[PDB]
Structures are given as structure tokens and as C-alpha cells.
Amino acid sequence: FKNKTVLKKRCKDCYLVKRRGRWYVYCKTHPRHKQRQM
Amino acid sequence: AAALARLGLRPVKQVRVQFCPFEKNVESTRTFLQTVSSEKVRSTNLNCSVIADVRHDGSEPCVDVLFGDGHRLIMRGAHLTALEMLTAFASHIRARDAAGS
Amino acid sequence: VKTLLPVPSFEDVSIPEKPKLRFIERAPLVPKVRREPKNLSDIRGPSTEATEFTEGNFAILALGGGYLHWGHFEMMRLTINRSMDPKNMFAIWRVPAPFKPITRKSVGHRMGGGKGAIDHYVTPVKAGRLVVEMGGRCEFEEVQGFLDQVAHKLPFAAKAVSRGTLEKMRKDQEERERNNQNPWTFERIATANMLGIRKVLSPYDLTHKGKYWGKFYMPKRV
Amino acid sequence: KFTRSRIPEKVFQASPEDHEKYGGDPQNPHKLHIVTRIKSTRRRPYWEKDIIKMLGLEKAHTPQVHKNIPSVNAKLKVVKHLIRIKPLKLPQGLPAEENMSNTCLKSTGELVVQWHLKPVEQ
Amino acid sequence: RGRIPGRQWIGKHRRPRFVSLRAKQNMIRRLEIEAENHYWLSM
Amino acid sequence: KKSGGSSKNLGGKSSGRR
Amino acid sequence: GSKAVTRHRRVMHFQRQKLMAVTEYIPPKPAIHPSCLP
Amino acid sequence: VLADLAIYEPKTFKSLAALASRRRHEGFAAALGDGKEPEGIFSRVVQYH
Amino acid sequence: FREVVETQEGKTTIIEGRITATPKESPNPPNPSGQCPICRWNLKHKYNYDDVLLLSQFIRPHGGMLPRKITGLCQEEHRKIEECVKMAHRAGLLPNHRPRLPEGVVPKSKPQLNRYLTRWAPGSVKPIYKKGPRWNRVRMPVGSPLLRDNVCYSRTPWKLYH
RNA sequence: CUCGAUGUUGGAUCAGGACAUCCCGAUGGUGCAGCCGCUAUUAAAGGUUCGUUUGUUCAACGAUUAAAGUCCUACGUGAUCU
Ligand code: FES
Ligand SMILES: [K+]
Ligand SMILES: [K+]
Ligand SMILES: [K+]
Ligand SMILES: [K+]
Ligand SMILES: [Mg+2]
Ligand SMILES: [Mg+2]
Ligand SMILES: [Mg+2]
Ligand SMILES: [Mg+2]
Ligand SMILES: [Mg+2]
Ligand SMILES: [Mg+2]
Ligand SMILES: [Mg+2]
Ligand SMILES: [Mg+2]
Ligand SMILES: [Mg+2]
Ligand SMILES: [Zn+2]
């Protein structure tokens, strides 16, 4: 998880989900793509 | 076919799709045939027969699945969607496979 | 039967011999000796030069006033020359090279003792001016990507535009002024000095009409 | 710099829609204004202070009558933001020597020549 | 916390003032009076 | 406290001619 | 004081703030939302 | 006087409250109408001259 | 509506579908020209989170929203009802539309806090530990901005931030 | 602001607070096999050494430590000391 002001999907397997009041990027194929809205 | 190809047809022994194409309630069952008759799904297990039985009796469409364990799944598609039948079919594959192993 | 549509043809378009952006020098050819006043009104208000397309079809529009130093020109040049197709694209400068001298006093010194020495040069830009103009055998979606990337790095509010989006932008502003349901507008009040309001306004507000504040431009103001 | 303000002449050209809204007659202009100061001269330039005095408007909320003529209007325009201008209406005509002492200026701008302080029998 | 640098209502950094609904209505009320003044000064 | 420079512009102090 | 052109957005005189507030664009509102009609 | 009436003449004050309430309801009826309705009985103003 | 029944007898499962009774829209809508159920009955701007008789017609048996393509609502009204349903659940106004619980699951006892006009999900909101100055106060949202155009019978407009 | 005086470095004594965390806790990512690391989220309850030279704050060096944190407090503290 890296904090990001602008969330961007980095591959086709990234999906945007809003959890605990903020947006996240989750990716099972490449966990390094995981992002947290700052 | 992509979602059903991931799971495979390993525990399945036969799949028989019966419908009367001149009737008005066969579209879901014909869509089920399109998905399971795909080369991707069929290539997951070459010992599983996929049979299409066309009829003109006026009977309601049926999908009869025989698993290797000996259990049967009968999905009557007159009032089922192709997605529902494929979801149920996937669920029983996920179960019968565990029982055998 | 998915319906296909015709495609525009750019065969009639010509490409210059040097499509890339030329190099901009830090300082003018001959260095200036006479030191100049700050003259902040060169970035204040609407632009009256380089507001229309000349050769190309696409550009970066300035939505505010500012000064372009040499560091900005290098960012524009390299970013554009790298992202463009020399065969089917071409770009030109719509702003002159830095000519306005900016003095600085040596660090640590007190107020007074005359004026500082010329440090660097800048190019003043007003709101509504085209900074770079592109064209060639290309659509807007092709250049808009890296043009907006450049526009974001400018010291003022900027945005990539085309002959169409610029025209629509201007006609949309005129439409808002006509159908405005508010019976009170900044212009009417200011020009008639209603409420004695000119005691808190500027002489320039008679022409800017509340759309401009310092170097900032407010497009939502009618 | 803050200076006196030149008002464009177009500001004082009434449109047909204005005549409907306010009810004036362009062909029969009113003769006299009713002018009342409703704003302070504090925090206003001295030239505005000076004109308020000339018009006899030093005391707020005190109606003064003035001639509706270009010269007077020129002064009124300088301080238009400090005052309220209404037309003097004469529903029973001008006061005469007999009724000089029985007049009252109503809030509607009508100067009546009889003031009985009685209810209307009608 | 939440201090305003220097004096509140002067200088570079100031306490922000906001326009209330009644401040707007007050201004519009005087705009209507002046608009009518314009009319009666036109004839 | 660094020592500063000086202005090199002299004269120019005439009053208005009226 | 600050100059007429500043790097930050200069604070306005309160009377000017009110002027801006009172002269904001008001869009024409239709009686019936156009999406609610054939 | 209104404060004095509330303390020492509560029946007169209730009548005044009723009168105000009646005039308030007449206002609403008038505002809702399109001019067809005649003026309310308590809304009529006595004119002086 | 359509029900799906799974009947397992011996080694053979049978999946079927039956058509049950379907409710019909009340006859003679007051605004036949209306383009969605809301404006066909002149209900636009005239319903709130507590109008469960209205809201309950557009939700699934377990409390979930129904698709806009099925109900026929417009995007604007569909979003208003969606937010209103979330507030109705959180206020406890839909006690017979609770989530489906798998066999053997009994929720633990949780503290009961009565609430209404709840915009956010309780677990996703942090305490306001620093309120900030009067001129930059952190506010507690109440209600939904989607309902800002609802008919207001008072002279004060709806306060959406407390 | 204070010159009809608001005592000026470092140290001693006692420490209050911030977290932009040095150690200890909980997590995501890794060019994370493991052992060690790097990076980010969360965490301020508790802890954060002794010495040689130098007035020193620092710095270098010796020996340790789970770690020898960054800062604010009139560069905290002289009607408590030096
Ligand atoms: S179309 Fe009328 S409210 Fe949706
Ligand atoms: K920028
Ligand atoms: K200040
Ligand atoms: K002193
Ligand atoms: K020593
Ligand atoms: Mg202060
Ligand atoms: Mg001279
Ligand atoms: Mg002189
Ligand atoms: Mg100045
Ligand atoms: Mg003293
Ligand atoms: Mg401590
Ligand atoms: Mg932290
Ligand atoms: Mg100290
Ligand atoms: Mg002391
Ligand atoms: Zn990814």
C-alpha cells in the first residue's frame, strides 16, 4: 500500500473499491499496485 | 466460457442439453449450450461428453449433467437464465470434485 | 451490423521542414544594461496578442497570468518534441523568448543601497493567450494527452485546446451572459458606480468586469 | 487612484420596460423631486459630503423638494447612491394661500392640501 | 490552535470573512433603490 | 550584516518648472 | 500592503466580496425538468 | 403595555393573541388566493385623511 | 416475480423456476406524461428517508436496491431513493429487510444507538477530535445533499451540516 | 512591545508538550526463500548508555545498547545552582 492523492489502475487486474470511507486500488496479480487514497 | 474454463469439467462425465428450438422458452438453454460447447471448456476434460439433443415434442428444455461420482444435476431452463444455470453448474462442479478427492 | 463512419483525410496537410520546437535561449542575444521596473500589469487582465490560431489546429491556452522562465521553456520543448510524431506533427512557439530582465540583490543584504543586478529573464503571459501551437495529420485526442501534461507544469492555470473546443468555450461563455437570470451584474454596477462601489474597486475593473483578480482568471464569472 | 466617477449617459436613458415597472410618463415628466438622504457621508469622499450639504440633506430621513432640471440632476447624480429620489405628486393641485397651513406630505409622495385627521366616511 | 498571524483583519494573511444571506439581501435592497433613482433622473 | 552597495545614479533632483 | 498582482489570491475588501456574491451567474431553471417530459 | 397585559390582564391578552392569529390566517388565505377572494373581515384597513 | 427452487432427492438435484404473483402499478397515474414512476405520480421533491411505503417498492427482500433498468427510475431519482434506503436501514425503519444470514450464524449483542438522517456508515467515520476555528469549523454532515431540492415548507433551508 | 534593565553561551536540576517514530507493538509492498534489510500505513502508553580531548552546542574517537530519535517550551529552567 502506497498513499496516493490520484489513484490510477496500473494493470487490467486492478480494481477500485471504496472501503472505510476512502478509495483503494487492489490488485491480486501484482500486489505492488495496491494504493490508498491520501 | 472463461469463468467456466477456469474451474474445468474434471468431475463431469456427461452433459446433455435437450430443447425444442421451435419453442419460445429455449434461449437460456441454447445459451448454456454455447458456453459449455466452447473449445476452452471442452478442452478442460476430453472424457466428458457434451451432447445436444434436439427435439420437436413440445417438451420443456432440460439440462442433464452426470458426474463421475454418479450424481445427477437436472436444470430445467424454461424459467432459468443462462447465468443461473452456469452458476449452479459451477457450484456442483466445485462440490463433487472435493468429494471424489 | 455495427455502423462504420467516414474518417477525415489529412492528405491536404503539409508538414514544415523543422517540425520540432526550436531551442529557446536563456537570455537575449545582446545582454541588457538598463534595469527595468517591475511592471506587474504585463500579466494582469486579458491578453490582446496571440489569442487566435495561425498555422496549426491545437494549442495550450493560458487561463491565467504568469512569467515563463527558461526552465519552463525546456520543460515544454523536451516534453513536446519527445511525445510528438515528427512525420505527422509539427509545433511552433506562440510566446517570445525571455526578454524581461529580473534583478536580484545578493543574499543577506539589507534594504536599500540601490537596485539589484540583472539575474535572469522571463516572458510575461496574460490570460487567454496561446503558448504553443501544434498541427498536422492528427486528431485532438492524440496530442491532448501530452499537451495537458505540459499545461499542468506551467506556472499559471493552462489547458490544451483545439479550434473547436476553444470556439465552443467562447460561445458557451456568451450563452451564459445572455441567459443569466441574475438582474445584477458586476459590469452594470461598476460602470454606473452604484452604491459608490468604485471606492473599493480598481480603474481596471471597468474593463475586467469582475472576471479578473490580480493575475487570476475566473471563467465562471459572467 | 480613487477619483470622481463619470457616469455614462446611457445609465440615465429609460427603456420602455422601465416605464412599466416604475409608472412614469416620458412625455409628462414630473416637475419636482422628493429627495431623502438614507446613507451617511462618513467614509465617502469630501466632494460627496459637500454636495449633500448643498442639497440641504444634512439630516437623514428628512424629505427635501428640488427642481427636476439638468443642473440639479447633475448634483443628484454625484450622490445618487446616498439618497432616495421620488416624484412629488399633486393629486389636488398646488397648495393655495387658503390651504398653505393644512398640507401633509404622505409616504406615497403625494402632497395633500387637506389634512383632517378623520376617518373616511366612504 | 487556529491562530491568525498578526492582527486579524489586516496584512497578507487575514481572518476570512464570509457573506451571509442577510448581507446579500441588504445589498440587493439598496441596489433596487439606486436603480429606481436612475429612472427618475432620466426625464 | 553584509556590507551593501551604492546607487550609481546621481543628479536628477530638479524641481518642477511650473 | 501587497501589490495589485500577487502570487497568492489576495483577500478582497468586504464590500467587494459582497458585490461578487450578489452578481453570481444564475442559470435559467425550467418549470418542469426536461427529462420528465416526452 | 403588551407585557403588562400579559401579566395582569390574561383574558385581554388571549383575545389579542386570538386576533393576531385570526389576522395571520387571513393573510395565508389571501396569499394562496389569486385575487378572487374579497379582503378578510379583520384585514380591512380604516383609512384616514 | 420468479422463484428458483433447488430440490435434492437422493443422488439427483433438480433446479427449477416458477412464476409467482406479480404486483401491478395502480391504475390512472395523475401524470401519464411522466417519464419514470416518480414523476408519473408527481412525487418528485416530495419524499424523504422515512417514506418507507415509497422506498420499500424499489428494494429487494433482503434490503438491497433494485436495478434502474428494472424499476424504470431515472438516474437522478434512482440515486435519491438509493441514499434514502441506506438512511432508512440505518434508522431501523426496515426491520423485515435484513441481510441474509447463513445457517448457524447468530450476531453477537451490539450496543444500540438510535440514529436518523445518517449519511455515512457508522464504522467508516472518525471522531472530530479537533473542531477547528469558527471560520474553518469541521462540520458533522446530516442528511444527504441529493435531497437538497426537496420541497421546503419552512423559511429556513435544510441544514445539511451541523 | 521592552533601554526610570524583558540578565546575555554551554552544563547541573526538574522536566511539560508535538510526532515528521530512534527502540518496543500492529500492518501493506518488495528486485521479501531464510537470516538480515529497504519502503509505506498505524502507534507518543514505556524507553532512548558510559567515557577520552574541547568552554563548547556540535564533531571525532573508545566501549556498549532493543535504541543511543527529530523538535517546541523567552534557542524550557541563574528570585534553584554553575
Ligand atoms: S423522469 Fe420524472 S422524476 Fe424521473
Ligand atoms: K500549474
Ligand atoms: K495579519
Ligand atoms: K532594553
Ligand atoms: K575539558
Ligand atoms: Mg494577533
Ligand atoms: Mg526629475
Ligand atoms: Mg523634488
Ligand atoms: Mg498598493
Ligand atoms: Mg519599570
Ligand atoms: Mg518529558
Ligand atoms: Mg505518525
Ligand atoms: Mg534559554
Ligand atoms: Mg527564573
Ligand atoms: Zn494491477
PDB file of C-alpha atoms in Angstrom, chain C residues 13-208:
ATOM      1  CA  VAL C  13      -1.964  18.979 -44.883  1.00  0.00           C
ATOM      2  CA  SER C  14       1.695  19.957 -45.205  1.00  0.00           C
ATOM      3  CA  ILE C  15       4.487  19.418 -42.673  1.00  0.00           C
ATOM      4  CA  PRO C  16       7.286  22.020 -42.340  1.00  0.00           C
ATOM      5  CA  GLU C  17      10.969  21.133 -42.649  1.00  0.00           C
ATOM      6  CA  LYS C  18      11.664  21.610 -38.909  1.00  0.00           C
ATOM      7  CA  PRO C  19       8.504  20.332 -37.184  1.00  0.00           C
ATOM      8  CA  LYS C  20      10.104  20.192 -33.731  1.00  0.00           C
ATOM      9  CA  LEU C  21      10.197  23.193 -31.410  1.00  0.00           C
ATOM     10  CA  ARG C  22      13.310  25.318 -31.829  1.00  0.00           C
ATOM     11  CA  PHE C  23      15.665  25.972 -28.931  1.00  0.00           C
ATOM     12  CA  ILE C  24      15.000  28.992 -26.704  1.00  0.00           C
ATOM     13  CA  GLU C  25      17.998  30.788 -25.215  1.00  0.00           C
ATOM     14  CA  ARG C  26      18.313  31.787 -21.567  1.00  0.00           C
ATOM     15  CA  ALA C  27      18.976  35.469 -22.325  1.00  0.00           C
ATOM     16  CA  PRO C  28      18.646  37.579 -25.489  1.00  0.00           C
ATOM     17  CA  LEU C  29      21.500  37.871 -27.965  1.00  0.00           C
ATOM     18  CA  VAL C  30      22.811  41.182 -26.593  1.00  0.00           C
ATOM     19  CA  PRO C  31      22.591  41.485 -22.783  1.00  0.00           C
ATOM     20  CA  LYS C  32      20.564  44.409 -21.493  1.00  0.00           C
ATOM     21  CA  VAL C  33      22.144  47.015 -19.224  1.00  0.00           C
ATOM     22  CA  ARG C  34      19.229  49.326 -18.403  1.00  0.00           C
ATOM     23  CA  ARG C  35      17.341  47.886 -15.439  1.00  0.00           C
ATOM     24  CA  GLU C  36      13.562  47.906 -15.744  1.00  0.00           C
ATOM     25  CA  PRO C  37      10.688  48.429 -13.291  1.00  0.00           C
ATOM     26  CA  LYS C  38       8.598  45.532 -12.062  1.00  0.00           C
ATOM     27  CA  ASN C  39       5.594  46.497 -14.236  1.00  0.00           C
ATOM     28  CA  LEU C  40       3.290  43.762 -12.953  1.00  0.00           C
ATOM     29  CA  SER C  41       0.483  44.884 -15.288  1.00  0.00           C
ATOM     30  CA  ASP C  42       2.024  42.835 -18.125  1.00  0.00           C
ATOM     31  CA  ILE C  43       0.448  39.635 -16.733  1.00  0.00           C
ATOM     32  CA  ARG C  44      -2.750  41.305 -15.499  1.00  0.00           C
ATOM     33  CA  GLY C  45      -6.005  41.211 -17.437  1.00  0.00           C
ATOM     34  CA  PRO C  46      -6.959  39.630 -20.755  1.00  0.00           C
ATOM     35  CA  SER C  47      -4.402  39.026 -23.474  1.00  0.00           C
ATOM     36  CA  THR C  48      -4.544  41.157 -26.626  1.00  0.00           C
ATOM     37  CA  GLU C  49      -1.958  39.204 -28.638  1.00  0.00           C
ATOM     38  CA  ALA C  50      -1.630  35.577 -29.750  1.00  0.00           C
ATOM     39  CA  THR C  51      -5.250  34.768 -28.892  1.00  0.00           C
ATOM     40  CA  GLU C  52      -6.093  33.079 -32.218  1.00  0.00           C
ATOM     41  CA  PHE C  53      -4.793  30.125 -34.198  1.00  0.00           C
ATOM     42  CA  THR C  54      -2.394  30.925 -37.043  1.00  0.00           C
ATOM     43  CA  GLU C  55      -0.990  27.774 -38.695  1.00  0.00           C
ATOM     44  CA  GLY C  56      -1.779  24.757 -36.525  1.00  0.00           C
ATOM     45  CA  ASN C  57      -5.018  23.496 -35.042  1.00  0.00           C
ATOM     46  CA  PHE C  58      -4.130  22.655 -31.431  1.00  0.00           C
ATOM     47  CA  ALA C  59      -2.589  24.693 -28.634  1.00  0.00           C
ATOM     48  CA  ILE C  60      -2.140  25.243 -24.905  1.00  0.00           C
ATOM     49  CA  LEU C  61      -4.372  28.056 -23.666  1.00  0.00           C
ATOM     50  CA  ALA C  62      -3.283  30.186 -20.718  1.00  0.00           C
ATOM     51  CA  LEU C  63      -6.049  30.557 -18.124  1.00  0.00           C
ATOM     52  CA  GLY C  64      -4.029  32.974 -16.002  1.00  0.00           C
ATOM     53  CA  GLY C  65      -1.115  35.356 -15.955  1.00  0.00           C
ATOM     54  CA  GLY C  66       2.458  34.434 -15.160  1.00  0.00           C
ATOM     55  CA  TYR C  67       6.109  34.565 -16.153  1.00  0.00           C
ATOM     56  CA  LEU C  68       7.824  31.845 -18.193  1.00  0.00           C
ATOM     57  CA  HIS C  69      11.481  31.457 -17.278  1.00  0.00           C
ATOM     58  CA  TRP C  70      13.964  29.382 -19.268  1.00  0.00           C
ATOM     59  CA  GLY C  71      13.289  26.352 -17.072  1.00  0.00           C
ATOM     60  CA  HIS C  72       9.698  26.364 -18.326  1.00  0.00           C
ATOM     61  CA  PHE C  73      10.701  26.504 -21.996  1.00  0.00           C
ATOM     62  CA  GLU C  74      12.979  23.474 -21.631  1.00  0.00           C
ATOM     63  CA  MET C  75      10.155  21.524 -19.991  1.00  0.00           C
ATOM     64  CA  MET C  76       7.819  22.441 -22.857  1.00  0.00           C
ATOM     65  CA  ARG C  77      10.361  21.751 -25.606  1.00  0.00           C
ATOM     66  CA  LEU C  78      11.669  18.377 -24.427  1.00  0.00           C
ATOM     67  CA  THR C  79       8.253  17.068 -23.374  1.00  0.00           C
ATOM     68  CA  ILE C  80       6.635  18.018 -26.688  1.00  0.00           C
ATOM     69  CA  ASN C  81       9.492  17.060 -29.014  1.00  0.00           C
ATOM     70  CA  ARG C  82       9.682  13.647 -27.331  1.00  0.00           C
ATOM     71  CA  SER C  83       5.939  12.910 -27.369  1.00  0.00           C
ATOM     72  CA  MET C  84       5.188  14.110 -30.922  1.00  0.00           C
ATOM     73  CA  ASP C  85       5.472  12.283 -34.237  1.00  0.00           C
ATOM     74  CA  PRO C  86       7.810  14.413 -36.402  1.00  0.00           C
ATOM     75  CA  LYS C  87       6.385  12.890 -39.587  1.00  0.00           C
ATOM     76  CA  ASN C  88       2.720  13.734 -38.925  1.00  0.00           C
ATOM     77  CA  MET C  89       3.007  16.594 -36.404  1.00  0.00           C
ATOM     78  CA  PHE C  90       4.644  19.993 -36.054  1.00  0.00           C
ATOM     79  CA  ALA C  91       4.842  22.582 -33.289  1.00  0.00           C
ATOM     80  CA  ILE C  92       5.652  26.287 -33.049  1.00  0.00           C
ATOM     81  CA  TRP C  93       6.220  28.810 -30.277  1.00  0.00           C
ATOM     82  CA  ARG C  94       3.454  31.335 -29.631  1.00  0.00           C
ATOM     83  CA  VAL C  95       5.486  33.187 -26.969  1.00  0.00           C
ATOM     84  CA  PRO C  96       8.769  35.094 -27.468  1.00  0.00           C
ATOM     85  CA  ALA C  97      11.997  34.123 -25.771  1.00  0.00           C
ATOM     86  CA  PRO C  98      12.699  35.572 -22.299  1.00  0.00           C
ATOM     87  CA  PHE C  99      13.322  39.305 -22.711  1.00  0.00           C
ATOM     88  CA  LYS C 100      12.149  40.941 -19.476  1.00  0.00           C
ATOM     89  CA  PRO C 101      15.113  41.247 -17.063  1.00  0.00           C
ATOM     90  CA  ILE C 102      14.607  40.315 -13.407  1.00  0.00           C
ATOM     91  CA  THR C 103      17.029  41.823 -10.896  1.00  0.00           C
ATOM     92  CA  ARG C 104      18.088  40.217  -7.620  1.00  0.00           C
ATOM     93  CA  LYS C 105      20.033  41.513  -4.652  1.00  0.00           C
ATOM     94  CA  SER C 106      22.893  39.432  -3.303  1.00  0.00           C
ATOM     95  CA  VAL C 107      21.820  37.210  -0.420  1.00  0.00           C
ATOM     96  CA  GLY C 108      21.975  38.512   3.138  1.00  0.00           C
ATOM     97  CA  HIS C 109      21.870  42.250   2.450  1.00  0.00           C
ATOM     98  CA  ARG C 110      19.632  44.901   3.997  1.00  0.00           C
ATOM     99  CA  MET C 111      17.029  47.083   2.310  1.00  0.00           C
ATOM    100  CA  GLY C 112      18.440  49.979   0.304  1.00  0.00           C
ATOM    101  CA  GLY C 113      21.707  50.663  -1.453  1.00  0.00           C
ATOM    102  CA  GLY C 114      20.241  50.991  -4.940  1.00  0.00           C
ATOM    103  CA  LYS C 115      18.783  48.328  -7.225  1.00  0.00           C
ATOM    104  CA  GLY C 116      19.933  44.757  -7.697  1.00  0.00           C
ATOM    105  CA  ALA C 117      21.738  43.258 -10.666  1.00  0.00           C
ATOM    106  CA  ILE C 118      20.024  41.508 -13.565  1.00  0.00           C
ATOM    107  CA  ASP C 119      19.676  37.834 -12.614  1.00  0.00           C
ATOM    108  CA  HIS C 120      17.548  36.151 -15.301  1.00  0.00           C
ATOM    109  CA  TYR C 121      14.952  36.860 -17.990  1.00  0.00           C
ATOM    110  CA  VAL C 122      11.280  35.897 -18.278  1.00  0.00           C
ATOM    111  CA  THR C 123       8.449  36.021 -20.808  1.00  0.00           C
ATOM    112  CA  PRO C 124       5.236  37.615 -19.461  1.00  0.00           C
ATOM    113  CA  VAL C 125       1.998  35.832 -20.362  1.00  0.00           C
ATOM    114  CA  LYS C 126      -1.580  37.070 -19.959  1.00  0.00           C
ATOM    115  CA  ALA C 127      -4.745  35.022 -19.588  1.00  0.00           C
ATOM    116  CA  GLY C 128      -6.287  33.893 -22.861  1.00  0.00           C
ATOM    117  CA  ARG C 129      -3.026  33.581 -24.814  1.00  0.00           C
ATOM    118  CA  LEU C 130      -1.818  30.572 -26.783  1.00  0.00           C
ATOM    119  CA  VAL C 131       1.582  29.390 -25.560  1.00  0.00           C
ATOM    120  CA  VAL C 132       2.356  26.557 -28.001  1.00  0.00           C
ATOM    121  CA  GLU C 133       0.529  25.697 -31.227  1.00  0.00           C
ATOM    122  CA  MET C 134       0.552  22.252 -32.844  1.00  0.00           C
ATOM    123  CA  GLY C 135      -0.882  20.841 -36.044  1.00  0.00           C
ATOM    124  CA  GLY C 136      -0.556  18.244 -38.757  1.00  0.00           C
ATOM    125  CA  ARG C 137      -2.128  14.903 -39.634  1.00  0.00           C
ATOM    126  CA  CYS C 138      -3.526  14.194 -36.184  1.00  0.00           C
ATOM    127  CA  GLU C 139      -6.738  14.347 -34.176  1.00  0.00           C
ATOM    128  CA  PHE C 140      -7.201  16.182 -30.881  1.00  0.00           C
ATOM    129  CA  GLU C 141      -7.147  13.032 -28.745  1.00  0.00           C
ATOM    130  CA  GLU C 142      -3.625  12.226 -29.955  1.00  0.00           C
ATOM    131  CA  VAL C 143      -1.961  15.466 -28.853  1.00  0.00           C
ATOM    132  CA  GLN C 144      -4.297  16.299 -25.955  1.00  0.00           C
ATOM    133  CA  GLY C 145      -2.585  13.757 -23.701  1.00  0.00           C
ATOM    134  CA  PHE C 146       0.918  15.218 -23.632  1.00  0.00           C
ATOM    135  CA  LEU C 147      -0.311  18.785 -24.171  1.00  0.00           C
ATOM    136  CA  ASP C 148      -2.309  18.650 -20.931  1.00  0.00           C
ATOM    137  CA  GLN C 149       0.740  17.105 -19.259  1.00  0.00           C
ATOM    138  CA  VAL C 150       2.705  20.195 -20.307  1.00  0.00           C
ATOM    139  CA  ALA C 151      -0.116  22.583 -19.396  1.00  0.00           C
ATOM    140  CA  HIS C 152      -0.156  21.187 -15.854  1.00  0.00           C
ATOM    141  CA  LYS C 153       3.527  22.073 -15.359  1.00  0.00           C
ATOM    142  CA  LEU C 154       3.122  25.739 -16.319  1.00  0.00           C
ATOM    143  CA  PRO C 155       3.302  28.460 -13.628  1.00  0.00           C
ATOM    144  CA  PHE C 156      -0.293  29.514 -14.420  1.00  0.00           C
ATOM    145  CA  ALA C 157      -3.610  27.779 -14.997  1.00  0.00           C
ATOM    146  CA  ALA C 158      -3.391  26.329 -18.514  1.00  0.00           C
ATOM    147  CA  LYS C 159      -5.231  23.787 -20.636  1.00  0.00           C
ATOM    148  CA  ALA C 160      -4.887  22.105 -24.016  1.00  0.00           C
ATOM    149  CA  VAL C 161      -7.461  23.253 -26.572  1.00  0.00           C
ATOM    150  CA  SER C 162      -8.357  22.903 -30.238  1.00  0.00           C
ATOM    151  CA  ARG C 163     -10.012  25.161 -32.788  1.00  0.00           C
ATOM    152  CA  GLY C 164     -13.326  23.558 -31.825  1.00  0.00           C
ATOM    153  CA  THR C 165     -13.080  23.414 -28.038  1.00  0.00           C
ATOM    154  CA  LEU C 166     -11.785  26.993 -27.944  1.00  0.00           C
ATOM    155  CA  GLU C 167     -14.693  28.177 -30.097  1.00  0.00           C
ATOM    156  CA  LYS C 168     -17.220  26.241 -28.013  1.00  0.00           C
ATOM    157  CA  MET C 169     -15.639  27.603 -24.826  1.00  0.00           C
ATOM    158  CA  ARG C 170     -16.170  31.162 -26.059  1.00  0.00           C
ATOM    159  CA  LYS C 171     -19.719  30.570 -27.303  1.00  0.00           C
ATOM    160  CA  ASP C 172     -20.597  28.890 -24.001  1.00  0.00           C
ATOM    161  CA  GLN C 173     -19.434  31.997 -22.133  1.00  0.00           C
ATOM    162  CA  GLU C 174     -21.589  34.229 -24.345  1.00  0.00           C
ATOM    163  CA  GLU C 175     -24.588  31.940 -23.816  1.00  0.00           C
ATOM    164  CA  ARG C 176     -24.226  32.246 -20.037  1.00  0.00           C
ATOM    165  CA  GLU C 177     -24.163  36.044 -20.262  1.00  0.00           C
ATOM    166  CA  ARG C 178     -27.363  36.103 -22.327  1.00  0.00           C
ATOM    167  CA  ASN C 179     -29.472  33.652 -20.295  1.00  0.00           C
ATOM    168  CA  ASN C 180     -28.176  34.888 -16.922  1.00  0.00           C
ATOM    169  CA  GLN C 181     -31.227  35.198 -14.678  1.00  0.00           C
ATOM    170  CA  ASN C 182     -29.454  37.438 -12.154  1.00  0.00           C
ATOM    171  CA  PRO C 183     -30.647  41.019 -12.824  1.00  0.00           C
ATOM    172  CA  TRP C 184     -27.461  42.355 -11.176  1.00  0.00           C
ATOM    173  CA  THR C 185     -24.099  42.053 -12.932  1.00  0.00           C
ATOM    174  CA  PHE C 186     -20.648  43.281 -11.976  1.00  0.00           C
ATOM    175  CA  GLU C 187     -20.400  45.429 -15.116  1.00  0.00           C
ATOM    176  CA  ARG C 188     -23.692  47.306 -14.686  1.00  0.00           C
ATOM    177  CA  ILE C 189     -22.960  48.065 -11.030  1.00  0.00           C
ATOM    178  CA  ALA C 190     -19.332  49.097 -11.544  1.00  0.00           C
ATOM    179  CA  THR C 191     -19.799  51.249 -14.652  1.00  0.00           C
ATOM    180  CA  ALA C 192     -22.664  53.169 -13.016  1.00  0.00           C
ATOM    181  CA  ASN C 193     -20.781  53.369  -9.686  1.00  0.00           C
ATOM    182  CA  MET C 194     -23.871  52.079  -7.903  1.00  0.00           C
ATOM    183  CA  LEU C 195     -23.598  52.036  -4.097  1.00  0.00           C
ATOM    184  CA  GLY C 196     -20.436  54.095  -4.522  1.00  0.00           C
ATOM    185  CA  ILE C 197     -18.780  50.743  -5.192  1.00  0.00           C
ATOM    186  CA  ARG C 198     -15.896  52.273  -7.160  1.00  0.00           C
ATOM    187  CA  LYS C 199     -14.339  53.232  -3.807  1.00  0.00           C
ATOM    188  CA  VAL C 200     -13.370  49.561  -3.303  1.00  0.00           C
ATOM    189  CA  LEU C 201     -12.733  48.711  -6.969  1.00  0.00           C
ATOM    190  CA  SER C 202      -9.904  49.404  -9.415  1.00  0.00           C
ATOM    191  CA  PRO C 203      -9.973  51.505 -12.601  1.00  0.00           C
ATOM    192  CA  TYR C 204      -9.225  48.264 -14.463  1.00  0.00           C
ATOM    193  CA  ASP C 205     -12.395  46.674 -13.058  1.00  0.00           C
ATOM    194  CA  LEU C 206     -14.386  48.788 -15.525  1.00  0.00           C
ATOM    195  CA  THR C 207     -12.952  46.590 -18.306  1.00  0.00           C
ATOM    196  CA  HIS C 208     -12.242  43.326 -16.465  1.00  0.00           C
TER     197      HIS C 208
END
